[PDB]
């Protein structure tokens with residue numbers, strides 16, 4: 298029972314939905330490719346493509362500053378939840 | 390204005406991004422918007438789909454990376470703790 | 485063996501990298517060494533020069549990123565504090 | 580006077596030298612491009628190329644695990660030293 302995790306999850310999903318909508322409508326990517334671009338951008342993995350429109354470039358700059366902190370907060374909380382069963386099985 | 394460290398990191402981040410925009414548009418021939426995009430994705434460690442083509446560009450980018458990552462991520466951290474986190478919390482209050 | 489959290493993160497990291505090696509060599513057709521390279525650069529956030537071409541590959545990679553980054557960086561942190569830092573310190577002692 | 584910073588600097592330079600030597604001899608890159616590859620790898624910015632030899636791929640995997648922590652420790656210490664004059668000029 299972790300409302301902090303639940304809220305971070307919601308915020309992450311909503312942020313990825315917004316990017317998917319944006320890149321699929323403004324940059325003309327298939328939904329899966331718009332989601333992929335959004336994910337590799339906010340996780341800092343990085344893309345092998347870039348936006349073609351000035352609007353898309355500006356959006357991506359702002360999207361990084363809006364979303365990078367949240368995404369890494371979520372990744373951290375996710376890691377705690379995913380590794381804890383193994384830690385506890387190896388402890389008590 | 391309450392957190393002076395945040396104020397400094399913000400100004401330094403803006404100046405760093407202006408410097409990169411000027412550099413890449415002059416030396417690497419990018420349009421200013423593409424030079425700003427390149428600077429942002431580089432200093433946040435996202436990475437661009439392109440890379441510098443000139444030796445000057447490569448050397449500058451190495452130095453810009455080392456100095457710039459620390460500042461931009463210091464700014465992102467302060468933005469998260471001083472702006473985004475309080476805004477999220479406020480927006481979760483039932484009214 | 486003294487730090488059980490480090491032990492768990494190490495094993496989980498190895499299993500995660502084996503899973504990626506198997507996945508990318510089967511679904512994306514990469515040689516195993518290229519699948520391992522891709523998995524490593526992806527989960528450390530370095531990023532590859534390539535990207536998945538199949539929709540299965542794209543979906544898997546999104547999930548692998550979210551689960552894998554946290555584990556691999558947990559491992560890197562533990563490796564730094566429990567192995568690399570004590571080794572550096574020991575190697576700086578005049579004898 | 581910061582021996583911690585001095586040591587991190589030395590370790591970083593030696594690590595970048597080793598990568599420059601490796602990628603310029605094994606992967607046939609010009610020195611500047613071997614240094615660039617080493618830097619964007621350890622800082623996690625990422626490269627638009629990859630090693631062509633199996634030896635180079637294996638080396639890069641190990642190089643990441645050997646060097647990423649040190650490089651980020653250095654980047655942090657560098658940031659403290661670079662921003663402190665501005666903070667202090669804005670304070671005392």
Ligand SMILES: [Cl-]
Nearest residue numbers: 382383386387
């Ligand atoms: Cl178990």
Ligand SMILES: [Cl-]
Nearest residue numbers: 420421422423
């Ligand atoms: Cl422009």
Ligand SMILES: [Cl-]
Nearest residue numbers: 515516517518
């Ligand atoms: Cl192979």
Ligand SMILES: [Cl-]
Nearest residue numbers: 664665668669
């Ligand atoms: Cl001053």
Ligand SMILES: [K+]
Nearest residue numbers: 342343344531
């Ligand atoms: K990338």
Ligand SMILES: [K+]
Nearest residue numbers: 345438533627
């Ligand atoms: K690329």
Ligand SMILES: [K+]
Nearest residue numbers: 346347348349
């Ligand atoms: K483009």
Ligand SMILES: [K+]
Nearest residue numbers: 343344436437
């Ligand atoms: K990239």
Ligand SMILES: [K+]
Nearest residue numbers: 341434529623
């Ligand atoms: K990165």
Ligand SMILES: [K+]
Nearest residue numbers: 531532625626
């Ligand atoms: K890359």
Ligand SMILES: [K+]
Nearest residue numbers: 530531624625
């Ligand atoms: K990257």
Ligand SMILES: [K+]
Nearest residue numbers: 436624625626
């Ligand atoms: K990159």
Ligand SMILES: [K+]
Nearest residue numbers: 628629630631
């Ligand atoms: K290659």
